[PDB]
Amino acid sequence: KXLXKXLXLXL
Amino acid sequence: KXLXKXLXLXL
Amino acid sequence: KXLXKXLXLXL
Amino acid sequence: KXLXKXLXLXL
Amino acid sequence: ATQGVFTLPANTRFGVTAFANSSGTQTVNVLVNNETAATFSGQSTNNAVIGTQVLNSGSSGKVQVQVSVNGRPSDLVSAQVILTNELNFALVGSEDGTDNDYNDAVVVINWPLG
Amino acid sequence: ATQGVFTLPANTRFGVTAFANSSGTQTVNVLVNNETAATFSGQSTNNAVIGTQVLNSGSSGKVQVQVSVNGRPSDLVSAQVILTNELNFALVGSEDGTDNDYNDAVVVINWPLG
Amino acid sequence: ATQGVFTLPANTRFGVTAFANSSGTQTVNVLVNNETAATFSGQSTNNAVIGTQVLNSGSSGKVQVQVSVNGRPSDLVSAQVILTNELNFALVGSEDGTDNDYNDAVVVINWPLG
Amino acid sequence: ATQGVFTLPANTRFGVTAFANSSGTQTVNVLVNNETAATFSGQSTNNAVIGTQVLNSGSSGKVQVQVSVNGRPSDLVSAQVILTNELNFALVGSEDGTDNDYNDAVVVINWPLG
Ligand SMILES: *C(=O)C[C@@H]1O[C@@H](C)[C@@H](O)[C@@H](O)[C@@H]1O
Ligand SMILES: *C(=O)C[C@@H]1O[C@@H](C)[C@@H](O)[C@@H](O)[C@@H]1O
Ligand SMILES: *C(=O)C[C@@H]1O[C@@H](C)[C@@H](O)[C@@H](O)[C@@H]1O
Ligand SMILES: *C(=O)C[C@@H]1O[C@@H](C)[C@@H](O)[C@@H](O)[C@@H]1O
Ligand SMILES: [Ca+2]
Ligand SMILES: [Ca+2]
Ligand SMILES: [Ca+2]
Ligand SMILES: [Ca+2]
Ligand SMILES: [Ca+2]
Ligand SMILES: [Ca+2]
Ligand SMILES: [Ca+2]
Ligand SMILES: [Ca+2]
């Protein structure tokens, strides 16, 4: 979706 | 297709 | 282990 | 054979 | 060996798509936990998509593909392939006659979605 | 390593089908002998088929799948699988962002047809 | 469907390797153009390499893997996978009994070599 | 995309086997849960088995294959294939140079064992 959205960091 | 038709014999 | 399939022929 | 990638550095 | 049965991760959405390549009408049954979840039926000799759906693998994750032509089960071949430890394909081919091209119905299952 | 390039048997009909799973619009270019033979473009987060066609592998048999989103190439993963020495799948996944699900465009190539 | 038969490129060196996971002694025959090119034999329940050999596919490229235990043919599963359009694996599993783990003899064929 | 990383079932014995096809000495590290479980090393241009070992996937199931030549990491290609929903192969090829045959070290992981 873009910035801030479900990036894939696992935080 | 059925009988007689491209059976797969290689004849 | 053992013979495998085909044991227990018969009754 | 030889060193591989990264030969021919420079000019 | 059994073919056309795949264990997916539980409760996971997956795509199932069926292609047809035969003079016979292909009927594809997709079972999830041994119950029909989608049914496709169509005829094509040109690789037409006779059906494509999003399903959920449910509590068991068991997905089974069945293919039949005029009520008789086709012989199946299948395998699962995983790319970069993440992208999954479960693949099925089927043969309804004698020429053994195994494309008469082709079924592709893919996950994850979204 | 190079991904998304497959050597098919020459002059052979094959199916190519593209699925989309991303907020971004996927553009899929299918090259045969280094020339565009089909172009797909669509958007879906639900595994929609954005395109499916029958192509001919031509004199060279070289088929290449390219995927881009807003003009930028996606990272590809690919493999070919052959069942019963006859039924061929060439498989492509692609990633357009950061989550590495590699499903943003999924491309399935299958042969033989008919 | 037929399993354990693979078409390799002609006159190409390939590796064939067999692993054993069974109480029964495994005999693996590798046929090239219907001639016996290699016979492996061994017993292991710990995946021992019971044989590995470089062979040549000959003019036809036809390679067939047969597996037997005490003279009884095993049920085979197989597929071929190609990575980056270059690296080939032909894979065979086999079942000599009732538990359907299909690992009793596992055979891996790989090419190219060198 | 990441290559050479596979998720195995937890606490499961698996086989890992490495073949060499290169003028360069191949070093293969097999990591389980980021710990070095095995190191293979050898040189062959004839597909020699430079190592084979039974290992355990541990509580996490995370297995990573690394390949290096004289300290330099090789480029990896990989995939996982599952036959009859039971028999698993995790496959790795690697390129240490310029010819892109990706066979310089070939690694096969298989499970279940026994
Ligand atoms: C956002 O643009 C990223 C993008 O779309 C998401 C819905 C998800 O499919 C993600 O995998 C994709 O890269
Ligand atoms: C005839 O019914 C056989 C059948 O249809 C052919 C056109 C071809 O697709 C063949 O593979 C299929 O079994
Ligand atoms: C007995 O011969 C059966 C046989 O050996 C077992 C130890 C186990 O490996 C089983 O899978 C195999 O068929
Ligand atoms: C030289 O080190 C290159 C190397 O060894 C060659 C004999 C050949 O196997 C090549 O593929 C490999 O990269
Ligand atoms: Ca057919
Ligand atoms: Ca057909
Ligand atoms: Ca993505
Ligand atoms: Ca996505
Ligand atoms: Ca068994
Ligand atoms: Ca066994
Ligand atoms: Ca090389
Ligand atoms: Ca090499």
| Cβ-contact H33, H55 below 8 angstroms | no
Determined by X-ray
- What's the rounded Cα separation, in Å, for the pair G32 and G39? 12
Atom of ligand 4 nearest to the CA of G114: 9
Length of chain A: 11
Indicate the top mutation candidate among F96, F98, F101, F106 to test ligand 1's pocket, ranked by most ligand atoms within 8 A of CB: F96
For residue H38, what are the domain limits? 1-114
Which residues have CB under 8 Å from E105's CB, separation 6+?
E18, E19, E20, E21, E22, E26, E28, E50, E67, E74, E92, E93, E94, E96
- What's the rounded Cα separation, in Å, for the pair G71 and G26? 9
- What's the rounded Cα separation, in Å, for the pair H102 and F69? 29
Q: Is G35 known as a binding-site position?
A: no
Phi-psi region of H84 (alpha: psi -120 to 50; beta: other; left: phi over 0): left
Resolution in A: 1.6
- On whether any CB of chain E is under 8 Å from the CB of H5, the answer is yes
- On whether any CB of chain H is under 8 Å from the CB of G108, the answer is yes
Query: Residue H69 is which amino acid?
Result: V
Centre of ligand 1 to C-alpha E23, Å, is 40
- CB pair distance less than 8 Å for H86 and G100: yes
The candidate with the shortest Cα–Cα distance to F106, out of H8, E112, G53, G16, is E112
- What's the rounded Cα separation, in Å, for the pair H20 and H4? 16
Length of chain G: 114
- CB pair distance less than 8 Å for C5 and G69: no
- What's the rounded Cα separation, in Å, for the pair E80 and F81? 9
Locate tokens 């299958």: which residue? F110
- What's the rounded Cα separation, in Å, for the pair F14 and F65? 13
Q: How far is H107 from chain D (nearest CA, A)?
A: 21
Locate tokens 């086709």: which residue? E74
- How is E26-93 classified by DSSP, letter by letter? EEEEEEETTEEEEEEEEEEEEEEEEEEEEEE-TTT-EEEEEEEETTEEPEEEEEEEEETTTEEEEEEE
The candidate with the shortest Cα–Cα distance to H53, out of H71, H75, H33, H30, is H30
Please work out, in degrees rounded to the nearest 5, the angle formed at the alpha carbon of residue G43 by the alpha carbons of H30 and E77: 70
Q: Which two tokens stand for residue E97?
A: 């006659």
Q: Which residues crowd ion ligand 12, with CB under 5 Å?
A: H 21-22, 101, 103-104
- How is G57-73 classified by DSSP, letter by letter? -TTT-EEEEEEEETTEE
| Cβ-contact E51, E79 below 8 angstroms | no
> Structurally, how many domains does chain E consist of?
1
The candidate with the shortest Cα–Cα distance to G93, out of G81, G105, G109, is G105
The candidate with the shortest Cα–Cα distance to H58, out of H39, H38, H76, is H38
Would you call E8 exposed, middle or buried from its count of C-beta atoms within 10 A (0-12, 13-18, 19+)?
buried
Q: How many CB atoms lie within 10 A of CB B6?
A: 13
- On whether any CB of chain F is under 8 Å from the CB of H96, the answer is no
Long-range contacts (CB closer than 8 Å, 24 or more residues apart) made by A6-10: A6/F99, A7/F98, A7/F99, A8/F98, A8/F99, A8/F100
- How is H27-80 classified by DSSP, letter by letter? EEEEEETTEEEEEEEEEEEEEEEEEEEEEE-TTT-EEEEEEEETTEEPEEEEEE
- What's the rounded Cα separation, in Å, for the pair G70 and G67? 10
Percent of chain G as helix, strand, coil, to the nearest 5: 0, 70, 30
* Residues facing F107 on adjacent strands: F18, F92
The candidate with the shortest Cα–Cα distance to G104, out of G79, G64, G77, G85, is G77
The candidate with the shortest Cα–Cα distance to G82, out of E83, F38, E109, is E83
Cite the beta strand spans of chain F per DSSP E.
Answer: 5-7, 13-32, 35-56, 62-69, 72-73, 75-83, 87-95, 105-111
The candidate with the shortest Cα–Cα distance to E54, out of E14, E25, E92, is E14
How far CA H5 is from CA of E92, F88, H29, in Å, comes to: 26, 25, 12
- What's the rounded Cα separation, in Å, for the pair H66 and H71? 11
